[PDB]
Design a protein around this ligand. Structure first.
Ligand SMILES: O=P(O)(O)OC[C@H]1O[C@H](O)[C@H](O)[C@@H]1O
Ligand SMILES: [Mn+2]
Ligand SMILES: [Mn+2]
Ligand SMILES: [Mn+2]
Length: 391
């Protein structure tokens, strides 16, 4: 193998400017990093700059360098959707025609009617809402009537809340499985179904650790599957295992924050493994992008950047670090949905003694998967062109 270990970091939603097909998605003008940098009056990301972020695109506080540490370019998304699952499935070698849907006006009557018909239970709510706010609003009615609180967020989710003393846990799980079946439909294609059991009384409801998430398998066997099948390590950090529904994963490390994600990355650097360590830094998307908070987003980017020199120090000669994103989520953009953007790509190994150069623009995110597959000598994905030989 060229590299013994590859560390792949997805900065979730960290887009680098509107894609050629942005107009189709209502995303003209979008620019996640660029708009953040303007808000911050210059983003302080000196380590990403050293890697070559400014060499991809110059932005406020982010300038090109004469000798970037590694190779750099951006990637264009080929799949139809601009969600997390689509972006990640494409990164690992797939092409996804069917987009996962978001529901700012709630779910279609047709879907909810069938859910009622299959379960024998009434549905209340049916709107985007905070999971804690909707319990204060509707939790008492739920307890009194045995109905189901169905709600959504800014992402592709269908969430079902029910009190554990009124609707038995095992019944809530059965209901969610029915919903998971019904939502495998492009009339109303939902990324995740989530059980949200709660306890307590009006004015004091608590959501329990009995939450369960019902994910879809990726629409194809991924490069992760092939790595696992060839007895390589595939270490998933953060939301990675959930995003792939565990497919191809050999170890999973839960994280509570971006800083905790970087700590687990450091943990994997300290492990003797051969294969892939795959981190998702989700805070950018979950806390700041959807909430349209450019200040919080900018601060989070600066906090992430400050962690990188320790990562640089621990990389071995036969390690490769890949940093990218899975879509955009411009915090100064109308609405609450993601944005269709190019994503940055930085590729760095300490073995790059003369620094890096510009790579040709990656025409699919699957180029990452192809590179990983070629490195480890496993079956090449159907889509994607490796850049391994360019490094
Ligand atoms: O805490 P809630 O408001 O119920 O749910 C918000 C998000 O919590 C989970 O990460 C899902 O991504 C949801 O979109
Ligand atoms: Mn838009
Ligand atoms: Mn994402
Ligand atoms: Mn999102």
């Amino acid at each position: 193998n060229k590299y013994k270990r590859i560390f792949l970091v997805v900065m979730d939603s960290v887009g680098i400017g509107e894609a050629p097909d942005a107009e189709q998605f209502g995303d003209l003008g979008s620019d996640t990093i660029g708009h953040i940098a303007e808000h911050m009056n210059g983003l302080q990301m000196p380590n990403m700059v050293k890697l070559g972020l400014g060499n991809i695109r110059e932005m406020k506080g982010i300038s090109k360098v004469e000798k970037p540490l590694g190779y750099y370019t951006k990637m264009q998304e080929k799949s139809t959707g601009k969600d997390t699952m689509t972006g990640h499935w494409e990164i690992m070698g797939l092409y996804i025609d069917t987009p996962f849907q978001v529901f700012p006006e709630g779910f279609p009557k047709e879907l909810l009617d069938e859910l009622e018909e299959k379960t024998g239970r009434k549905i209340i709510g049916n709107k985007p809402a905070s999971g804690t706010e909707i319990l204060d609003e509707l939790g008492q009615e739920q307890m009194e009537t045995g109905s189901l609180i169905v709600y959504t967020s800014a992402d592709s989710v269908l969430q079902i809340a029910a009190h554990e003393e009124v609707v038995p846990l095992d019944e809530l799980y059965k209901i969610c499985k029915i919903a998971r079946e019904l939502t495998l439909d492009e009339k109303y294609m939902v990324g995740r179904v989530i059980a949200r059991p709660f306890v307590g009384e009006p004015g004091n409801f608590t959501r329990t650790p009995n939450r369960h998430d019902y994910a879809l398998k990726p629409f194809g066997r991924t490069v992760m599957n092939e790595l696992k099948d060839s007895d390589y390590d595939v270490i998933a950090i953060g939301k990675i295992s959930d995003i792939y529904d565990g497919e191809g994963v050999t170890e999973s490390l839960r994280t509570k924050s971006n800083m905790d994600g970087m700590d687990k990355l450091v943990d994997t650097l300290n492990m003797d493994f051969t294969g892939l360590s795959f981190l998702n830094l989700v805070d950018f998307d979950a806390l700041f992008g959807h909430r349209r908070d450019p200040q919080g987003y900018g601060e989070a980017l600066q906090e992430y950047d400050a962690r990188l020199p320790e990562v640089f120090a621990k990389l071995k000669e036969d390690d490769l670090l890949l940093i990218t994103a899975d879509h955009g989520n411009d915090p100064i953009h109308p609405g609450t949905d993601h944005t269709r953007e190019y994503v940055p790509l930085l590729a760095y190994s300490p073995s790059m003694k003369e620094g890096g150069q510009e790579l040709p623009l990656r025409q699919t995110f699957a180029d990452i998967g192809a590179t990983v597959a070629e490195n480890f000598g496993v079956k090449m994905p159907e889509y994607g062109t490796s850049f391994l030989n360019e490094l």
